[PDB]
């Protein structure tokens, strides 16, 4: 029984009377969850994991792609767009017959290499597929301390995934009918930046600095996300200007967006009038380091995102699939 890639199936507690599009998708693609799900510990077993070379992530990516293509599909670029209810629900990925999922329960597993307290499970934990850049919202948190993960930290081209241990509530709200904004506690964010700098400090050998994004598509320069069917784009300049030994971020709703899942563009109706508000738990970050021209005085980190595989990766890192034979 060695790691093998195969199509998993998904389970969820989606609600069939609900037209909310995650519920509609899940009703068709997923099955109800097992009432008493078993989890078995594997004594005297070491097994290797690699979140960056994990097929589970790809399958989830493909699944969420078909989810958006089925549920949302407004119009543009070659094509009706009723408004829809949008709020991710937790999805479990489950192994068919003849396969099994190994789960790493090791404390502070950095994402790659040997895991010695390995167990087997029928299904993953419930994972809500939140689409976001630079910040990870409504995700899972490491219990002991913040955990940062990378395929090779010394490769500046390679993304860094930060997992928080304390979450930071962020409230975004729309009472210019397109003007919105997000609020979070400054002191707690300063302390968050601190707990990240301490772990970055474990690697460096180097004084750390945070900068806002250098550029690129709107989706990755800002904290881009969905809320009530509307697409928010928040300036994160205020979160990421810092140098180490309340915060209102101005946001805009955009009708014309890039589709994260394929080349082209999607165009939606302007947002509905009335009340739009999202209170989300910031639970992680995706960061990128400049490199190439560092200097003994500054290491620069910037908010990242764009490849949603990393979003899934932040939840599926503890899991691997094997052909039980």
């Amino acid at each position, epitope marked *: 029984w060695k790691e093998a890639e195969t199509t998993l199936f998904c389970a969820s507690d989606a609600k069939a009377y609900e037209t909310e599009k995650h519920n509609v998708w899940a009703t068709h693609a997923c099955v109800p969850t097992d009432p008493n799900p078993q989890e078995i510990h594997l004594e005297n077993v070491t097994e290797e994991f690699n979140m*960056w*070379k994990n*097929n589970m992530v*790809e399958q989830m990516h493909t699944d969420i792609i078909s989810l958006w293509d089925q549920s949302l599909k407004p119009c543009v*670029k070659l094509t009706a767009c009723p408004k829809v209810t949008f709020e991710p629900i937790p999805i479990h990925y489950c192994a068919p017959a003849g396969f099994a999922i190994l789960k790493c329960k090791d404390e502070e597993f950095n994402g790659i290499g040997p895991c010695k307290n390995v167990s087997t499970v029928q299904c993953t934990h419930g994972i809500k597929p939140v689409v976001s850049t630079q910040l990870l919202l409504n995700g899972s948190l490491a219990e002991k301390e913040v955990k940062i993960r990378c*395929e090779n930290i*010394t*490769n*500046n*081209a390679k*993304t860094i995934i930060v997992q928080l241990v304390n979450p930071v509530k962020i409230n975004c709200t729309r009472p210019d009918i397109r003007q919105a904004h997000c609020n979070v506690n400054r002191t707690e964010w300063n302390n968050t930046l601190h707990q990240v700098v301490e772990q970055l400090r474990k690697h460096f050998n180097k004084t750390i600095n945070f900068a806002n994004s*250098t*550029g*690129g*598509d709107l*989706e*990755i320069t800002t904290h881009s996300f969905n809320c009530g069917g509307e697409f928010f784009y928040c300036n994160t300049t205020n979160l990421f200007n810092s140098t180490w030994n309340t915060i209102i971020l101005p946001c805009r709703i955009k009708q014309i967006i*890039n*589709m994260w899942q*394929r*080349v*082209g*563009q999607a165009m939606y109706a302007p947002p509905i009038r009335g009340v739009i508000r999202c209170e989300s738990n910031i639970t992680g970050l995706i960061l*990128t380091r400049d*490199g*190439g*021209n560092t200097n003994s005085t500054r290491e620069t980190f910037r908010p*990242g*995102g*764009g*490849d949603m595989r*990393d979003n899934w990766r932040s939840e599926l890192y503890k899991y691997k699939v094997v052909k039980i034979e």
Partner: antibody
Amino acid sequence: GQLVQSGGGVKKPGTSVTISCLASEYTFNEFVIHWIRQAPGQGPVWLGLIKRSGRLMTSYKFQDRLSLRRDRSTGTVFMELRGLRLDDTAVYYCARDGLGEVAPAYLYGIDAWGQGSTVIVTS
Amino acid sequence: IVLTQSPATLSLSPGERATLSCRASQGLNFVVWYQQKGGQAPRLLIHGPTDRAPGVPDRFSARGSGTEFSLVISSVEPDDFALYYCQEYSSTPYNFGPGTRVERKR
């Protein structure tokens, strides 16, 4: 074959040149695309890349004159090189690379190249 | 990082074993290799991590670890006389080696 391009040609010194690189949907969606130039009788020089996430990265040695961008509407990537000099004269390639980021195998290696765009800076 | 290649030129007769060298300023996991003929773009020979890309014939092999890498051609064919570059991925900017020219011995 996979990556088409259409860069400029003769440029007067001081001007700027923009080179586009039309990519297949798959390459554009899944791969990194380097911008690499090669002057006559010399080896290749890495100028910058665009990751599938949209991340732009440029060579420290060109960052003041070089701007990269991608067009998610059409699946095209671009490089602009400004303040052209005679020694910027080279064949410019866009070329793709999984960079250990594609789903199967996770391989590095520049396996597909555009046809190249010759840029000759002179008056 | 920086990569240097040796020799500058390799003179060889057809049938002979070619071995090209690539040296790295710091520790690398691997390096990739390209073949280039005049007027054409580089053609990938060796993927990273090793071994060899699709379409590449069997006579091509590659090896090394850490600082030192080499590309080996077991039995040189006329088609193999060309310029070969090695290339590194440790961080941007990604450096190419200066190239080793393979010519016909005389």
